[PDB]
């Protein structure tokens, strides 16, 4: 592989569900590349079974010189219109950071995400409680990444 | 919605599991757009599977005329290596044909797909003997509001 990730740091973790994801990625490039890299962030739900995955954002990174390179990929939060059952945001979900070169994926970094709603505030401590997405919090387990590598051509 | 789908015709149906998907798509664009459309096709397994969706292919379409447009989206087949429980390519899966403008998905066309196969040693599912059939007359459409320009 001509590109190798050296570090991925999630700048804003924990965070509110609706906050953008900010990943600070450092990589090395060992040979000349004619094109930009294409990074992607995909939101993946629970074994919930009635959820389709959702591309949050893609980012073209370049030009890319040989050396150690760095950038921040700020991705949109999940679109809840794509999440019919609102209650499926809760519990453990997955987040996939991948990169492609000329439409061919070569790397994929998967993380587990913990999701949880605030309990009642003191004033509130009757009505059934909605899942208020503005009161849901994520925490990505940025120290336990699952990495998968794909052979592509780099010519 | 500034873009609307008029027809989706599956060109090579039924077909072998490992044959490319070919969708002839006709859509109407009503206003000028600054950017391309971004099509994707997404393999979706069973409820019983723990595998997240598999993006099979994507394609920029553009620039977009005001009017009625047609193109063909030819998408690579599923990668067998990302299906660790190979048996769940069998029976009824899903394909989602979707389109995004500026990284926002505005339309999703969902299909059911039927899949069937043509001392003793355990056998593995032979993929070259699996046929798919997309149920192309019964698409489930979903529009989402996006910002466009």
């Amino acid at each position: 592989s001509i590109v190798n990730i050296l570090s991925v740091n999630v700048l804003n973790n924990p965070a509110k569900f609706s906050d953008p994801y900010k990943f600070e990625i450092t990589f090395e490039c060992l040979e000349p590349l004619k094109s930009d890299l294409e990074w992607k962030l995909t939101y993946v739900g629970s074994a919930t079974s009635q959820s389709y995955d959702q591309i949050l954002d893609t980012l073209l990174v370049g030009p890319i010189p040989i050396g150690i390179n760095k950038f921040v990929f700020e991705a949109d939060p999940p679109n809840i219109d794509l999440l019919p059952q609102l209650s499926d945001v809760l519990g453990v979900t997955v987040i996939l950071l991948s990169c492609a070169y000329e439409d061919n994926e070569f790397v994929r970094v998967g993380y587990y995400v913990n999701n949880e709603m605030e309990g009642l505030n003191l004033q509130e401590m009757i009505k059934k409680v909605k899942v208020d997405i503005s009161k849901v919090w994520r925490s990505i387990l940025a120290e336990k990444p699952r990495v998968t590598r794909f052979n592509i051509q780099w010519d | 919605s500034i873009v609307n789908i008029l027809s989706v015709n599956v060109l090579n149906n039924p077909a072998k599991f490992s044959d490319p998907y070919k969708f002839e798509i006709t859509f109407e664009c009503l206003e000028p757009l600054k950017s391309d459309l971004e099509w994707k096709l997404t393999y979706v397994g069973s409820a019983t599977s723990q595998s997240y969706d598999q993006i099979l292919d994507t394609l920029l379409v553009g620039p977009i005329p005001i009017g009625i447009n047609k193109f063909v989206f030819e998408a690579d087949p599923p990668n067998i290596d990302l299906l660790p429980q190979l048996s769940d390519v069998l029976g009824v899966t899903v394909i989602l044909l979707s389109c995004a403008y500026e990284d926002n998905e505005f339309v999703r066309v969902g299909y059911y797909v039927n899949n069937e196969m043509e001392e003793i040693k355990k056998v593995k599912v032979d993929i070259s003997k699996v046929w798919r059939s997309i149920l192309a007359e019964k698409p489930r459409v979903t529009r989402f509001n996006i910002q466009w320009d």
Binding site: L60, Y101, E102 | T58, L60, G67, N69, K70, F71
Partner: peptide
């Protein structure tokens, strides 16, 4: 149909204008 490639190496297709009625 005319296939092309962006600066970034992305597959791009120009769509066939059938007609411009609305």
């Amino acid at each position: 149909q005319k296939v092309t490639i962006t600066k970034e190496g992305k597959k791009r297709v120009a769509p066939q204008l059938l007609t411009t009625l609305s």
